[PDB]
Write a protein that holds these residues in place. Structure first.
Motif, PDB file in Angstrom:
ATOM      1  N   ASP A  37      -2.027   5.243 -10.207  1.00  0.00           N
ATOM      2  CA  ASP A  37      -2.106   6.572 -10.796  1.00  0.00           C
ATOM      3  C   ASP A  37      -0.713   7.064 -11.178  1.00  0.00           C
ATOM      4  O   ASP A  37       0.290   6.382 -10.886  1.00  0.00           O
ATOM      5  CB  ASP A  37      -2.871   7.520  -9.876  1.00  0.00           C
ATOM      6  CG  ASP A  37      -2.064   7.972  -8.655  1.00  0.00           C
ATOM      7  OD1 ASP A  37      -1.110   8.761  -8.802  1.00  0.00           O
ATOM      8  OD2 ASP A  37      -2.430   7.614  -7.509  1.00  0.00           O
TER       9      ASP A  37
ATOM     10  N   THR B 226      -7.057   8.084 -10.688  1.00  0.00           N
ATOM     11  CA  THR B 226      -6.740   6.712 -10.329  1.00  0.00           C
ATOM     12  C   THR B 226      -7.498   5.724 -11.212  1.00  0.00           C
ATOM     13  O   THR B 226      -8.710   5.853 -11.436  1.00  0.00           O
ATOM     14  CB  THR B 226      -7.083   6.469  -8.878  1.00  0.00           C
ATOM     15  OG1 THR B 226      -6.215   7.288  -8.076  1.00  0.00           O
ATOM     16  CG2 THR B 226      -6.904   4.982  -8.484  1.00  0.00           C
TER      17      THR B 226
ATOM     18  N   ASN C 280       0.841  -1.186   0.000  1.00  0.00           N
ATOM     19  CA  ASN C 280       0.000   0.000   0.000  1.00  0.00           C
ATOM     20  C   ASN C 280       0.875   1.235   0.000  1.00  0.00           C
ATOM     21  O   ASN C 280       1.741   1.393   0.860  1.00  0.00           O
ATOM     22  CB  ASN C 280      -0.926   0.005   1.217  1.00  0.00           C
ATOM     23  CG  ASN C 280      -2.039   1.028   1.098  1.00  0.00           C
ATOM     24  OD1 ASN C 280      -1.949   1.971   0.311  1.00  0.00           O
ATOM     25  ND2 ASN C 280      -3.095   0.847   1.881  1.00  0.00           N
TER      26      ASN C 280
ATOM     27  N   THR D 216      -8.526   1.737 -11.516  1.00  0.00           N
ATOM     28  CA  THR D 216      -8.838   0.492 -10.739  1.00  0.00           C
ATOM     29  C   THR D 216      -8.564  -0.665 -11.661  1.00  0.00           C
ATOM     30  O   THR D 216      -9.128  -0.747 -12.783  1.00  0.00           O
ATOM     31  CB  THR D 216     -10.325   0.492 -10.303  1.00  0.00           C
ATOM     32  OG1 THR D 216     -10.669   1.726  -9.616  1.00  0.00           O
ATOM     33  CG2 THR D 216     -10.569  -0.698  -9.339  1.00  0.00           C
ATOM     34  N   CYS D 217      -7.631  -1.507 -11.262  1.00  0.00           N
ATOM     35  CA  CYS D 217      -7.306  -2.715 -12.000  1.00  0.00           C
ATOM     36  C   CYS D 217      -7.610  -3.968 -11.167  1.00  0.00           C
ATOM     37  O   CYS D 217      -7.498  -3.951  -9.924  1.00  0.00           O
ATOM     38  CB  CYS D 217      -5.821  -2.778 -12.366  1.00  0.00           C
ATOM     39  SG  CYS D 217      -5.307  -1.559 -13.612  1.00  0.00           S
TER      40      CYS D 217
ATOM     41  N   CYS E 210      -8.008  -3.329 -17.568  1.00  0.00           N
ATOM     42  CA  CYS E 210      -7.956  -1.866 -17.296  1.00  0.00           C
ATOM     43  C   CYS E 210      -7.041  -1.157 -18.284  1.00  0.00           C
ATOM     44  O   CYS E 210      -6.480  -1.748 -19.166  1.00  0.00           O
ATOM     45  CB  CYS E 210      -7.513  -1.591 -15.828  1.00  0.00           C
ATOM     46  SG  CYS E 210      -5.952  -2.409 -15.415  1.00  0.00           S
TER      47      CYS E 210
ATOM     48  N   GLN F  70      -6.196  -4.298  -2.533  1.00  0.00           N
ATOM     49  CA  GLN F  70      -6.955  -3.484  -1.619  1.00  0.00           C
ATOM     50  C   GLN F  70      -8.392  -3.905  -1.846  1.00  0.00           C
ATOM     51  O   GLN F  70      -9.070  -3.488  -2.826  1.00  0.00           O
ATOM     52  CB  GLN F  70      -6.770  -1.977  -1.904  1.00  0.00           C
ATOM     53  CG  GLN F  70      -5.327  -1.515  -1.792  1.00  0.00           C
ATOM     54  CD  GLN F  70      -4.727  -1.784  -0.397  1.00  0.00           C
ATOM     55  OE1 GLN F  70      -5.213  -1.260   0.632  1.00  0.00           O
ATOM     56  NE2 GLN F  70      -3.672  -2.573  -0.357  1.00  0.00           N
TER      57      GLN F  70
ATOM     58  N   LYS G  66      -8.916  -5.331  -5.378  1.00  0.00           N
ATOM     59  CA  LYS G  66      -8.592  -4.499  -6.541  1.00  0.00           C
ATOM     60  C   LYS G  66      -7.193  -3.884  -6.359  1.00  0.00           C
ATOM     61  O   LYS G  66      -6.697  -3.791  -5.233  1.00  0.00           O
ATOM     62  CB  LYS G  66      -9.593  -3.355  -6.691  1.00  0.00           C
ATOM     63  CG  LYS G  66     -10.991  -3.795  -6.950  1.00  0.00           C
ATOM     64  CD  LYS G  66     -11.074  -4.561  -8.242  1.00  0.00           C
ATOM     65  CE  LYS G  66     -12.540  -4.712  -8.621  1.00  0.00           C
ATOM     66  NZ  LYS G  66     -12.663  -5.729  -9.691  1.00  0.00           N
ATOM     67  N   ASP G  67      -6.534  -3.517  -7.469  1.00  0.00           N
ATOM     68  CA  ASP G  67      -5.269  -2.722  -7.393  1.00  0.00           C
ATOM     69  C   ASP G  67      -5.635  -1.313  -7.880  1.00  0.00           C
ATOM     70  O   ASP G  67      -6.574  -1.150  -8.671  1.00  0.00           O
ATOM     71  CB  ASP G  67      -4.221  -3.167  -8.358  1.00  0.00           C
ATOM     72  CG  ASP G  67      -3.648  -4.564  -8.080  1.00  0.00           C
ATOM     73  OD1 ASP G  67      -3.970  -5.152  -7.048  1.00  0.00           O
ATOM     74  OD2 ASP G  67      -2.826  -5.046  -8.923  1.00  0.00           O
ATOM     75  N   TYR G  68      -4.866  -0.344  -7.399  1.00  0.00           N
ATOM     76  CA  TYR G  68      -5.090   1.038  -7.729  1.00  0.00           C
ATOM     77  C   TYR G  68      -3.780   1.542  -8.361  1.00  0.00           C
ATOM     78  O   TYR G  68      -2.711   1.265  -7.841  1.00  0.00           O
ATOM     79  CB  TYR G  68      -5.493   1.780  -6.468  1.00  0.00           C
ATOM     80  CG  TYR G  68      -6.889   1.400  -5.972  1.00  0.00           C
ATOM     81  CD1 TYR G  68      -8.026   1.930  -6.584  1.00  0.00           C
ATOM     82  CD2 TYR G  68      -7.066   0.484  -4.928  1.00  0.00           C
ATOM     83  CE1 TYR G  68      -9.306   1.601  -6.143  1.00  0.00           C
ATOM     84  CE2 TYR G  68      -8.345   0.135  -4.488  1.00  0.00           C
ATOM     85  CZ  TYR G  68      -9.456   0.705  -5.094  1.00  0.00           C
ATOM     86  OH  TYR G  68     -10.725   0.378  -4.710  1.00  0.00           O
TER      87      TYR G  68
END
Length: 207
Positions: A101, A190, A46, A192-193, A121, A94, A97-99
């Motif tokens: 940016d 951001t 994170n 979301t993947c 994504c 998370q 999901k992965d984030y």
């Protein structure tokens, strides 16, 4: 997750990957023009960041200095880098999901493309000539374009109170790179993947 980190620039970069209080994988490495470094980032990381460091010198112990993105004089970064730094930022796994940016909140040194290498994504890119166009008050003598917070140290640029809006300086970054964060509280860019997606960070993706 696997991150492939490729230097498409015509000059050397020293790549870095940290979560602030620890290195990711080995933490840093010299990437020559066209070289690719593949790292493994432990799932659930994170607040991870990858960036490029420019004009660097290390000694034989891995200790030295970087004109941009210095992380306490170490070749193998444990801590975040000194602005100006274009930032690839990510939180993995998370709530499934992965984030991802890209951010210019800590300034801009090198153009970058952050693209997942697995389905589900889109990627993002900040590859305009920010350092050529940089407002005079932001332009770093060491190279790069600083964020206003770094230069002026005000509540408004640093979003100290959690209330802040856009500025002449955030709007500069946003106009040249709409898909990168321009200040702490921007409309989010951001992506979301799917959790456990994989990715490639490419420095100088067009050039």
């Amino acid at each position: 997750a696997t991150f492939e980190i490729v230097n498409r620039c015509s000059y050397t970069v020293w790549a870095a990957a940290s979560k602030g209080d620890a290195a990711l994988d080995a933490g840093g490495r010299q990437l020559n023009s066209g070289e690719s470094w593949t790292i493994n980032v432990e799932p659930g990381t994170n607040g991870g960041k990858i960036w490029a460091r420019t004009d660097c010198y290390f000694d034989d112990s891995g200790s030295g200095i970087c004109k941009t993105g210095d992380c306490g004089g170490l070749l193998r970064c444990k801590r975040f880098g000194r602005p100006p730094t274009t930032l690839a930022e990510f939180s993995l796994n998370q709530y499934g999901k992965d984030y991802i940016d890209i951010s210019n909140i800590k300034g801009f040194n090198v153009p970058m493309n952050f693209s997942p290498t697995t389905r589900g994504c889109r990627g993002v890119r900040c590859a305009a000539d920010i350092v050529g166009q940089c407002p005079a008050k932001l332009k770093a003598p060491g190279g790069g374009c600083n964020d206003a917070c770094t230069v002026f140290q005000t509540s408004e640029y640093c979003c100290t109170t959690g209330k802040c809006g856009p500025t002449e300086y955030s709007r500069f970054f946003k106009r040249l790179c709409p898909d990168a964060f321009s200040y702490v509280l921007d409309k989010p860019t951001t992506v979301t993947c799917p959790g456990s997606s994989n990715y490639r960070v490419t420095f100088c993706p067009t050039a």
